[PDB]
Amino acid sequence: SVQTAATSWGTVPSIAVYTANNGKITERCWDGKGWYTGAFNEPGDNVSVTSWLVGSAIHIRVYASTGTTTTEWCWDGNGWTKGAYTSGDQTAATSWGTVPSIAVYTANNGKITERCWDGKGWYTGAFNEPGDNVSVTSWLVGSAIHIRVYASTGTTTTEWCWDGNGWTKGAYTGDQTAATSWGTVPSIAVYTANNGKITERCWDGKGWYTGAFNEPGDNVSVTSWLVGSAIHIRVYASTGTTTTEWCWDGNGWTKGAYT
Ligand SMILES: CCN(CC)c1ccc2c(c1)Oc1cc(N(CC)CC)ccc1C2c1ccccc1C(=O)OCCOCCOCCn1cc(CO[C@@H]2O[C@@H](C)[C@@H](O)[C@@H](O)[C@@H]2O)nn1
Ligand SMILES: CCN(CC)c1ccc2c(c1)Oc1cc(N(CC)CC)ccc1C2c1ccccc1C(=O)OCCOCCOCCn1cc(CO[C@@H]2O[C@@H](C)[C@@H](O)[C@@H](O)[C@@H]2O)nn1
Ligand SMILES: CCN(CC)c1ccc2c(c1)Oc1cc(N(CC)CC)ccc1C2c1ccccc1C(=O)OCCOCCOCCn1cc(CO[C@@H]2O[C@@H](C)[C@@H](O)[C@@H](O)[C@@H]2O)nn1
Numbered sequence: 001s002v003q004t005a006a007t008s009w010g011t012v013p014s015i016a017v018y019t020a021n022n023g024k025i026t027e028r029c030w031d032g033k034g035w036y037t038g039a040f041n042e043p044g045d046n047v048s049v050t051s052w053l054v055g056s057a058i059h060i061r062v063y064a065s066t067g068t069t070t071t072e073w074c075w076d077g078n079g080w081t082k083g084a085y086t087s088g089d090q091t092a093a094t095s096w097g098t099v100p101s102i103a104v105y106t107a108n109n110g111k112i113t114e115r116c117w118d119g120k121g122w123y124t125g126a127f128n129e130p131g132d133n134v135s136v137t138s139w140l141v142g143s144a145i146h147i148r149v150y151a152s153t154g155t156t157t158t159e160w161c162w163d164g165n166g167w168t169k170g171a172y173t174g175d176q177t178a179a180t181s182w183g184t185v186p187s188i189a190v191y192t193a194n195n196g197k198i199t200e201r202c203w204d205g206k207g208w209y210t211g212a213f214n215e216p217g218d219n220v221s222v223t224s225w226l227v228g229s230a231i232h233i234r235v236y237a238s239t240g241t242t243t244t245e246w247c248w249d250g251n252g253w254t255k256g257a258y259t
Contacts, residue, residue: 001218004236004243005049008223009058015223017236017258018047018062019243025064028258035259040080042073045088050095050102063091063104070106086122087115094138096145105134105149112151127167129160132174137181137188150177150190157192172201173208178222182231191220191235198237213253215246234258 002021008014015030016038025047027038044064051060060075065088072083089108095101102117103125112134114125131151138147147162152174159170175194181187188203189211198220200211217237224233233248234256245256 001240002238002243003046003219004221004238005047005062006221006223006234006236007049007051007060008225008234009051009053011225011227013225013232014058015234016049016051016060017221017243018049019238020044020047020064021241023066025062030258035257040073040075042071042080044071046090048091048093048104050093052095052098052100054098059100061085061093061095061102063093065089065091065106068108070104084122085115085117087113090133092134092136092149094136094147096138096140097143101145103136103138103147105136107131107134107151110153112149127160127162129158129167131158133176135177135179135190137179139181139184139186141184146186148172148179148181148188150179152177152192155194157190171208172203176219178220178235180222180224180233182224182226187231189222189224189233191222193217193220193237196239198235213246213248215244215253217244 002019005018012032017028025044027040029038046065048063062073064071072085074081074083092105099119104115112131114127116125133152135150149160151158159172161168161170178191185205190201198217200213202211219238221236235246237244245258247254247256
């Protein structure tokens with residue numbers, strides 16, 4: 001089945017969804033007025049994405065992997081350009097602040113490792129754990145980053161936590177996952193594709209529970225945004241070459257307009 005990655009920004013919001021299909025990654029875009037085809041078109045069997053705003057200006061980083069080679073592509077308002085990133089493998093990316101800092105996790109032959117950017121060159125991070133699949137989400141509390149990495153082997157997903165004092169195993173209870181988070185509590189939703197079905201586990205600070213989302217798919221991606229205190233979630237569920245968007249806007253899961 002095709003494999004997707006999603007990011008979003010602002011409160012409209014804008015959404016970009018990257019799809020890897022038969023070794024090519026293409027882009028579909030939403031800015032409030034209909035889906036359209038974006039400019040990005042590069043080779044890849046696997047894709048991940050992160051983005052950040054500086055004022056009103058979006059910066060996008062797309063990580064495109066063939067075999068064991070990952071290429072970073074950069075959008076900074078003036079066309080796509082190849083980025084400095086160095087380390088098919090499967091990646092997950094997150095970013096924070098306006099520098100920004102970036103962490104890119106790679107699953108390669110049953111091991112996940114980490115490459116980091118803080119504005120002064122790529123380096124190897126401390127994270128090194130078993131896994132065939134990886135997803136990540138992060139949030140800031142002031143200047144302090146918190147990272148959650150979901151590492152899966154077979155049907156077992158292990159959560160790994162960075163909270164400024166080393167990687168520790170988290171309370172979360174191969175399958176493929178996607179994760180998003182919001183606020184400073186925070187809330188976290190983790191989607192898992194297992195045997196053609198996507199299910200949802202949720203944290204709001206008081207234990208993991210099963211969420212309401214339950215839809216068909218072999219691959220999943222997710223993005224979310226706040227409008228005030230209200231969370232909005234978009235889950236992209238793929239079977240074969242068909243991707244279905246599922247929308248949570250506080251009143252149940254509804255199918256979205258994505259094509
Ligand atoms: C922090 C807020 N923004 C948003 C507009 C910003 C500001 C300045 C630049 C920015 C962005 O981006 C670049 C990008 C390049 N490129 C094109 C992508 C080279 C490939 C070159 C310069 C800037 C400069 C630049 C302009 C003038 C003066 C300063 C600096 C400077 O960043 O630095 C402040 C700290 O000391 C100077 C370091 O600047 C050179 C080293 N470098 C590369 C990058 C950008 O690299 C890319 O983006 C990353 C976030 C990673 O994804 C990389 O792998 C990727 O290659 N930022 N700094
Ligand atoms: C007896 C258990 N309770 C009662 C709820 C408790 C325990 C610690 C604090 C508690 C409460 O409350 C506060 C309140 C504040 N304030 C008041 C000014 C502002 C919010 C500040 C600090 C505390 C702390 C505190 C004191 C010292 C050191 C740390 C922490 C800390 O926040 O959490 C540390 C984590 O373990 C103990 C916390 O117990 C609550 C249950 N739990 C687990 C997690 C974190 O779990 C991980 O991160 C998640 C986001 C998920 O990824 C998890 O799967 C993962 O395991 N947070 N709460
Ligand atoms: C011409 C009359 N028709 C049908 C022929 C109509 C009218 C209103 C809606 C319609 C359809 O459909 C939906 C569908 C959704 N879903 C599934 C039920 C996903 C959330 C949600 C809303 C509608 C609304 C709706 C309800 C409440 C608020 C707004 C909107 C809204 O869309 O606009 C109607 C008035 O114009 C406001 C400007 O927006 C027009 C087009 N539009 C769609 C959206 C929301 O679209 C969704 O969220 C996005 C961020 C993307 O993820 C989408 O792909 C997703 O469909 N915002 N604007």
